[PDB]
Amino acid sequence: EYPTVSEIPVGEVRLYQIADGVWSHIATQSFDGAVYPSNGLIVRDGDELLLIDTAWGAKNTAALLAEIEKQIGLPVTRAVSTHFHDDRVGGVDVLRAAGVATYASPSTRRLAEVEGNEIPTHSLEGLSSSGDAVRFGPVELFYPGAAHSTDNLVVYVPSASVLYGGCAIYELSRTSAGNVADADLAEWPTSIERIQQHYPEAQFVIPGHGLPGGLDLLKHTTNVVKAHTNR
Ligand SMILES: O=P(O)(O)Cc1cccc2cccnc12
Ligand SMILES: O=P(O)(O)Cc1cccc2cccnc12
Ligand SMILES: [Zn+2]
Ligand SMILES: [Zn+2]
Ligand SMILES: [Zn+2]
C-alpha cells in the first residue's frame, strides 16, 4: 500500500494520506548507481498547505507541486527544510519561484550556504538548543540535537499524532548506517531519546526514507547507529 521505488518512475511523485489532513510525499532519486526513495510531509492548515521538505531536486519538486495541485488543490504557502542536504533543500528554488515561502533554521541556512546548496529564504527562530520546540502553523518543530546532521529538525502533527523524523530516523528495513559524513554519531542516540521523551504519544512515525511505522523506529535507529559506532 505504501509506495516503493518500483512504483515511482524517476521525476515522479506519489502522495500518501497518513491521517486526515496529513500526507507524506514520496519520490525517488538516483545516486551512485542505486535508486533511493525519500519522504516529506504535507499538512493542511485551514485552506492552505504546509510543506515539509522538498522532493529531492528541482524536477521532483516541480512534479511535487503539480501533484499537490492535482490531488489536493490547496495552495502550498510555506515550506520547511529539516536539514541542509539535497533531499531536503534541493528544489527550494522551484518552491520560491512558485510563490512558496521557504523556511529553515539559521543553522541549516548557514550549512546549506557553505555547501553551495539552495538556501531557504526565511529563518526559523527558537530552535537553536537541543530540546527546543516551536509551533509553526499546524505542526510543532523540534530540534532534538545533532544526529544525522547537526541541524536536523523533526516535525510533529498534534492533531494527527504523526511524527516525521526526517533523515534522523531510519526505517526498519535499514540494518546499517547510510550517509553519516555530516552526522554526530556520539550524540545521535541522545537526540533520539529527546524525541522519545517529547512525543511518547506519537502513533505514526515517518522516516526520511522508506516505510512508516511506530515509535519502535526510534530505538531501531539507535541500535543501528550504535552498531555503526562500534564498526
Ligand atoms: O543518508 P541517509 O541515511 O539518510 C540515505 C542513505 C544514504 C546512503 C545509503 C543509504 C542506503 C539505504 C538507504 N539510505 C541510504
Ligand atoms: O544523507 P541524505 O540522505 O540526506 C542524502 C543522500 C541520500 C542517499 C545517498 C547519499 C550519499 C551520500 C550523501 N548523501 C546521500
Ligand atoms: Zn542528509
Ligand atoms: Zn517571504
Ligand atoms: Zn536522507
From TrEMBL:
Zn(2+) 6 binds at residue 220. Zn(2+) 1 binds at residue 47. InterPro entries: BlaB//VIM/IMP-1, Metallo-B-lactamas, NDM-1-like, RibonucZ/Hydroxyglut_hydro, VIM-1/2/7, VIM-1/2_MBL. Its EC number is 3.5.2.6. Zn(2+) 5 binds at residue 122. Mg(2+) 4 binds at residue 171. This is beta-lactamase. It comes from Pseudomonas aeruginosa. One of its GO terms (cellular component) is periplasmic space. Keywords: Antibiotic resistance, Hydrolase, Metal-binding, Periplasm, Plasmid, Signal, Zinc. Its cofactor is Zn(2+). The lineage of its organism: Bacteria, Pseudomonadati, Pseudomonadota, Gammaproteobacteria, Pseudomonadales. Residues 37-209 form the Metallo-beta-lactamase domain. Zn(2+) 2 binds at residues 83, 85, 87, 148. Zn(2+) 3 binds at residues 87, 167. It comes from the Bacteria. Belongs to the metallo-beta-lactamase superfamily. Class-B beta-lactamase family. The keyword rRNA-binding does not apply. Zn(2+) 4 binds at residues 87, 167, 209. GO terms for molecular function: beta-lactamase activity; metal ion binding. Monomer. Mg(2+) 3 binds at residue 138. It holds the Pfam family Lactamase_B. It catalyses: a beta-lactam + H2O = a substituted beta-amino acid. One of its GO terms (biological process) is antibiotic catabolic process. Mg(2+) 2 binds at residue 12. Class B beta-lactamase which confers resistance to the beta-lactam antibiotics, including penicillins, cephalosporins and carbapenems. Acts via hydrolysis of the beta-lactam ring. Has penicillin-, cephalosporin- and carbapenem-hydrolyzing activities.
